[PDB]
Design a protein around this motif. Sequence first.
Motif, PDB file in Angstrom:
ATOM      1  N   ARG A   1      23.806  18.180  36.055  1.00 39.03           N
ATOM      2  CA  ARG A   1      25.034  18.276  36.995  1.00 39.03           C
ATOM      3  C   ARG A   1      26.276  18.111  36.086  1.00 39.03           C
ATOM      4  O   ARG A   1      27.448  17.439  36.520  1.00 39.03           O
ATOM      5  CB  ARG A   1      24.592  17.353  37.997  1.00 39.03           C
ATOM      6  CG  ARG A   1      23.698  16.788  39.331  1.00 39.03           C
ATOM      7  CD  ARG A   1      23.059  15.896  40.509  1.00 39.03           C
ATOM      8  NE  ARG A   1      21.749  15.108  39.894  1.00 39.03           N
ATOM      9  CZ  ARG A   1      22.741  14.087  38.990  1.00 39.03           C
ATOM     10  NH1 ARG A   1      23.704  13.666  39.296  1.00 39.03           N
ATOM     11  NH2 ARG A   1      21.414  13.562  38.726  1.00 39.03           N
TER      12      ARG A   1
ATOM     13  N   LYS B   1      30.627  20.135  48.563  1.00 37.09           N
ATOM     14  CA  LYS B   1      29.384  18.403  48.176  1.00 37.09           C
ATOM     15  C   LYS B   1      28.683  17.910  48.766  1.00 37.09           C
ATOM     16  O   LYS B   1      29.053  17.662  50.007  1.00 37.09           O
ATOM     17  CB  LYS B   1      30.706  17.765  46.797  1.00 37.09           C
ATOM     18  CG  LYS B   1      30.457  17.453  45.642  1.00 37.09           C
ATOM     19  CD  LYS B   1      31.189  16.211  45.099  1.00 37.09           C
ATOM     20  CE  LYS B   1      30.495  14.847  45.322  1.00 37.09           C
ATOM     21  NZ  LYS B   1      29.416  14.666  44.616  1.00 37.09           N
ATOM     22  N   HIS B   2      27.551  17.951  48.537  1.00 40.10           N
ATOM     23  CA  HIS B   2      26.759  16.687  49.346  1.00 40.10           C
ATOM     24  C   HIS B   2      25.925  16.066  48.727  1.00 40.10           C
ATOM     25  O   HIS B   2      25.483  15.842  47.474  1.00 40.10           O
ATOM     26  CB  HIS B   2      25.547  17.632  50.860  1.00 40.10           C
ATOM     27  CG  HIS B   2      25.310  17.553  51.662  1.00 40.10           C
ATOM     28  ND1 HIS B   2      24.091  16.688  51.663  1.00 40.10           N
ATOM     29  CD2 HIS B   2      25.755  16.598  52.609  1.00 40.10           C
ATOM     30  CE1 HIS B   2      23.824  16.009  52.243  1.00 40.10           C
ATOM     31  NE2 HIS B   2      24.478  16.161  53.582  1.00 40.10           N
ATOM     32  N   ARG B   3      25.159  15.177  49.413  1.00 39.39           N
ATOM     33  CA  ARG B   3      24.386  14.022  48.192  1.00 39.39           C
ATOM     34  C   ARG B   3      23.216  15.089  48.076  1.00 39.39           C
ATOM     35  O   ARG B   3      22.258  14.775  46.892  1.00 39.39           O
ATOM     36  CB  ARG B   3      23.515  12.540  49.212  1.00 39.39           C
ATOM     37  CG  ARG B   3      23.481  13.532  50.825  1.00 39.39           C
ATOM     38  CD  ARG B   3      22.946  11.858  51.365  1.00 39.39           C
ATOM     39  NE  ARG B   3      21.838  12.397  52.200  1.00 39.39           N
ATOM     40  CZ  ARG B   3      20.420  12.316  51.944  1.00 39.39           C
ATOM     41  NH1 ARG B   3      20.092  12.548  51.133  1.00 39.39           N
ATOM     42  NH2 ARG B   3      19.434  13.123  52.992  1.00 39.39           N
ATOM     43  N   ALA B   4      22.739  15.818  48.919  1.00 42.39           N
ATOM     44  CA  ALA B   4      21.522  16.960  48.372  1.00 42.39           C
ATOM     45  C   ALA B   4      22.081  18.040  48.132  1.00 42.39           C
ATOM     46  O   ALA B   4      20.887  18.763  47.999  1.00 42.39           O
ATOM     47  CB  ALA B   4      20.280  16.834  49.417  1.00 42.39           C
TER      48      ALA B   4
ATOM     49  N   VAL C   1      25.343  20.766  45.679  1.00 41.03           N
ATOM     50  CA  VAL C   1      26.411  20.167  45.725  1.00 41.03           C
ATOM     51  C   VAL C   1      26.514  21.864  45.062  1.00 41.03           C
ATOM     52  O   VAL C   1      25.912  22.479  44.342  1.00 41.03           O
ATOM     53  CB  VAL C   1      27.325  19.652  44.148  1.00 41.03           C
ATOM     54  CG1 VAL C   1      26.161  19.750  43.953  1.00 41.03           C
ATOM     55  CG2 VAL C   1      28.400  19.508  44.043  1.00 41.03           C
TER      56      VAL C   1
END
Lengths: 72, 126, 55, 189, 143
Positions: A44, A61-64, A66
């Motif tokens: 990351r 993009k997402h919390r879970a 990308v």
Amino acid sequence: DKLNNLVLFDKATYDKLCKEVPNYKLITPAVVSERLKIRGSLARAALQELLSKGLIKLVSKHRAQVIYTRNT
Amino acid sequence: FRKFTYRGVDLDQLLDMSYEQLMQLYSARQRRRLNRGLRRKQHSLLKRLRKAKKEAPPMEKPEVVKTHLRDMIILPEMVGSMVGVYNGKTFNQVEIKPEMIGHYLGEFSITYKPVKHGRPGIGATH
Amino acid sequence: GHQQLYWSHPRKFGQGSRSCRVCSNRHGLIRKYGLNMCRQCFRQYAKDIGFIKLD
Amino acid sequence: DIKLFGKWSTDDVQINDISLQDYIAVKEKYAKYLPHSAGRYAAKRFRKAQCPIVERLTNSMMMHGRNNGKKLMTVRIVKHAFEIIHLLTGENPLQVLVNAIINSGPREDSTRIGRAGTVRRQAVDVSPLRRVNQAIWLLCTGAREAAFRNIKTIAECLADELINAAKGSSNSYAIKKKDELERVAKSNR
Amino acid sequence: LVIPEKFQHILRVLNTNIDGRRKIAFAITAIKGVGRRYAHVVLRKADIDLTKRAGELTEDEVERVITIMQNPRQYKIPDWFLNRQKDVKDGKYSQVLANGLDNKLREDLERLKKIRAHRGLRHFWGLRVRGQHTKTTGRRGRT
RNA sequence: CAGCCACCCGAGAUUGAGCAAUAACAGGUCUGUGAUGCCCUUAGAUGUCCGGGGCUGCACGCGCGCUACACUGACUGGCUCAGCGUGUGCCUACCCUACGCCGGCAGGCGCGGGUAACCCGUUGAACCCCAUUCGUGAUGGGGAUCGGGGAUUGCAAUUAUUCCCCAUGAACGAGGAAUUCCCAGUAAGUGCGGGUCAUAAGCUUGCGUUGAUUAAGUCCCUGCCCUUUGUACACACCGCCCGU
Ligand SMILES: [Mg+2]
Ligand SMILES: [Mg+2]
Ligand SMILES: [Zn+2]
């Protein structure tokens, strides 16, 4: 069997991260982690650094999840 | 090896201290109990222990006083006293040692016989 | 003396301080709404009290 | 102009299987913005054929207890892996999903013996609806156990599973299971 | 990029080996007196970057981390944060760490066995001491 | 024909419960009763108080369950939605709580409202949503066990009531034979209330919240009904009955 991923890059693995990852059709922390034998946190961080330098294009993009892609 | 010490303070100052100062050395609970007050028949046991200690001959152990009470092991005023704690059917003989401060009397008179198992029978495994 | 001992145990909160207002039993008691009756006595007197079955 | 999510059209999706044309609902009355419509498709028999195929996949994703009822998570997991199928293949993700459904559905399989029996199995043909159901179930199961105990996230396992099933490759769990069932049906003919 | 200045893959602190690949505040948790919360408070009051891994900190950083770990009240760590508050015998508040401190203070069961307290007796007999049923539970290691 | 299938219109084209026959069981309950017949006991009592034990005791076997084995996840912040309902008592002690202050916390101290569509409360629930760190390993998964402290309710908390803190950090990597419950706002996740309740829910009884896969069939297994048929059974196959 137990994989031994790196937590910080060495010069050999910092290489092959600056001239092949920018060419992948799909760039994801898990994909780079599996194809470079590095941890998810390092993947990351490396992808964020590449995106900051303009070599990678952010698709979503997402919390879970990308997703990055090659700049072409 | 070394003289006994409870929370940094030793035997003599423990005798010289009042209940209010005891509540600071005691743990939570045994502080709540003292703040709520020692009721009667606790003072009765304490005064019986005092009388037994006083009437004891020199260098000899005090006579054992028997009680039903799972009571505080109060400041060393009870230390050295020979107490028979009721376990349910017997007065078990217990000598109060300084390391027992802050405990209950019932911690030293077990109410059950420890289990030594026998051969399974009947419908043990149906 | 026996005067100070008889019934001297505190009875203010436990099951020993509550009982059925009908049968004086101490088990299965319904304290809701102030009924203070055991389950069986309540089933017996529910229609008289006004509790009826709908669903 | 009813692109899914807000990016995927349906006008170009071709079922081209004839047999399953009536049971894969993607095209004109079944073009919706989201794979979430509440819906009462389980009330009467066969109605689930009117349910959009993406919503059927979304529903099939909520599995193994800890994910029961979490449909917003599953619509996210479909939105991703559609974004990933597009990157990997360059084709419409809906087309890839439809091709996967076509390729992963068994055509024959074995039941207990014919009219009656308690020894062996007899081969029979598969209904189109059961074909679509089994295809969805197999694709979802393959994704689910590819992502288990692995740094590869869901929405990556599902994307690769759908891509392999569309390709017909044997790297796909669904294709392997379909071949296994079809071969057993062949042996019990 | 890995630090050339001898990135410590293995670090020895209190006769325990911590992993340099582990992020700090989770690498020092390997010390038998420190877990998570204590590690975080120690590193917060030692003013070290929490995003670093245990191999990138210098000798001075690890030294001051060890000192603040062994003297919590000297760096304004609250008394309710410690695992040896109002310790019997010497009524001193402290944090017991690693071999020689945590396991030796563990050997206060001999006090209970010497006074023959019921809890000490249950410890001596291998049974359970916190008033749990032993009918149908804990049947492992008891033949 | 009785009806069945599909479709339109339609809020709805099978909502869910309650009650429930003749007849029977040596089914459970004398431990719910000032319901009870016969026995037993009845003053060093099997009546009744009052101390203390027990009801938990642990080589082991068996049920109902709770928490898990993680990344479709843990952690940390941010954001934003319920419903059913219960609140100050005959004896009877024990209510639900806003707001202010003190304290990491659990708590504590003052002040008010409410006998309630009036106050708690606009019940600012959880999951879920958004971002963060972790990075495939018994790992930051998981929280058994255990130590040391702090509070609360109580007349007493030890065999640790309950709660808080800091430590410790076990098995468990999806479970063999064998089995349970389920057809739509359903299963399953997820919290919330009522009962119990001085102190208290891993139970139960209700309530919402998110919300599916599959099926629209059959007697294959398991039962249970019939109908015909046989009986030497009729206390009815746990029957009847033969010979040494
Ligand atoms: Mg049948
Ligand atoms: Mg006859
Ligand atoms: Zn009654």
